[PDB]
Amino acid sequence: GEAPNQALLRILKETEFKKIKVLGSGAFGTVYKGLWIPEGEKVKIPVAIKELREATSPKANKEILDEAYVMASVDNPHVCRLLGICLTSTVQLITQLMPFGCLLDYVREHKDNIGSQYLLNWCVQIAKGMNYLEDRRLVHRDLAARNVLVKTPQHVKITDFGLAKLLGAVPIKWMALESILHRIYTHQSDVWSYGVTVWELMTFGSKPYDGIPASEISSILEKGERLPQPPICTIDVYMIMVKCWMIDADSRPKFRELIIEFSKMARDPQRYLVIQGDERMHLPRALMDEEDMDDVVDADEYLIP
Numbered sequence: 017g018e019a020p021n022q023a024l025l026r027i028l029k030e031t032e033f034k035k036i037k038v039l040g041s042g043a044f045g046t047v048y049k050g051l052w053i054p055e056g057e058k059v060k061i062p063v064a065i066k067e068l069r070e071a072t073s074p075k076a077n078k079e080i081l082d083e084a085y086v087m088a089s090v091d092n093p094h095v096c097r098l099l100g101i102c103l104t105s106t107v108q109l110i111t112q113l114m115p116f117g118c119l120l121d122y123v124r125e126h127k128d129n130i131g132s133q134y135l136l137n138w139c140v141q142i143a144k145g146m147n148y149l150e151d152r153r154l155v156h157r158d159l160a161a162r163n164v165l166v167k168t169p170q171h172v173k174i175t176d177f178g179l180a181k182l183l184g185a186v187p188i189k190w191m192a193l194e195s196i197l198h199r200i201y202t203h204q205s206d207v208w209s210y211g212v213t214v215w216e217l218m219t220f221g222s223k224p225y226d227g228i229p230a231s232e233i234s235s236i237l238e239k240g241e242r243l244p245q246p247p248i249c250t251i252d253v254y255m256i257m258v259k260c261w262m263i264d265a266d267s268r269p270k271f272r273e274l275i276i277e278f279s280k281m282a283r284d285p286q287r288y289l290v291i292q293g294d295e296r297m298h299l300p301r302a303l304m305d306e307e308d309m310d311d312v313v314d315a316d317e318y319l320i321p
């Protein structure tokens with residue numbers, strides 16, 4: 017029925033990597049900024065290390081290891097890569113460092129400097145990663161601006177596959193109606209979440225259905241109400257979002273189609289998004305933490321035999 021998953025899972029010694037700083041904490045564990053030196057080879061890889069805080073909850077480790085399983089099985093430029101696992105007292109996940117953090121945080125913080133070309137490009141890249149997931153038959157089940165991470169301002173990646181599932185077996189506001197009423201998730205249900213994600217970027221990090229109970233939400237959608245058109249948005253871009261939020265899932269557009277549409281728009285960005293002083297704006301020694309290392313390589317340039 018299915019092809020063998022011959023992904024490699026790499027086990028890392030604790031000595032191989034060092035933790036430099038805490039990016040985040042709370043929930044299952046805390047995630048650290050870090051440096052990883054692989055074995056005999058002399059290279060330094062910037063990593064995000066995530067490890068568990070409330071002891072070794074057996075309940076909890078299934079979630080962390082499932083995340084690792086899914087992450088190892090994916091190889092795509094616009095999907096986040098897991099370098100390794102460290103089997104210490106606490107399970108540790110070593111992932112590629114996305115220096116500029118959360119895409120949601122980024123749009124909010126830099127809204128004044130984010131041009132249409134960047135926005136349309138991000139839309140394209142998310143569609144590409146999500147289409148890749150479709151090829152895999154993996155479903156994100158939780159696509160949001162919060163779950164997209166930015167390696168460079170010109171290069172984002174999808175993340176948070178912990179909840180990810182194979183096709184064919186809470187973020188209510190991002191969820192499709194079919195998902196709300198019947199707990200049904202498909203690639204197409206994923207597309208709807210993609211539409212909400214796009215809306216978040218177009219609104220520069222605004223919150224969808226702000227000050228609405230999730231209890232309300234199903235009725236509203238049943239009512240046929242949807243998110244408002246963003247100021248910056250032309251009707252062409254807004255229509256794409258609307259198609260994503262259609263009740264009939266097969267009616268909704270495919271990720272492969274979404275790649276096509278946004279790319280056309282990316283060709284002539286000012287026609288599809290109108291932003292004050294769009295022409296002016298520019299978006300990003302450098303290497304924080306360590307002074308010592310010019311042996312640093314990105315995870316992306318670091319490949320395995």
Ligand SMILES: *CCc1cc(=O)n(-c2ccccc2)c2nc(Nc3ccccc3OC)ncc12
Binds near residue numbers: 175
């Ligand atoms: C794929 C790698 C990965 C996963 C991940 O879960 N996080 C993450 C996301 C949200 C909160 C904490 C960690 C990653 N984060 C980062 N970088 C990062 C996180 C928070 C703030 C600032 C950041 O960049 C400097 N990189 C990869 C993550």
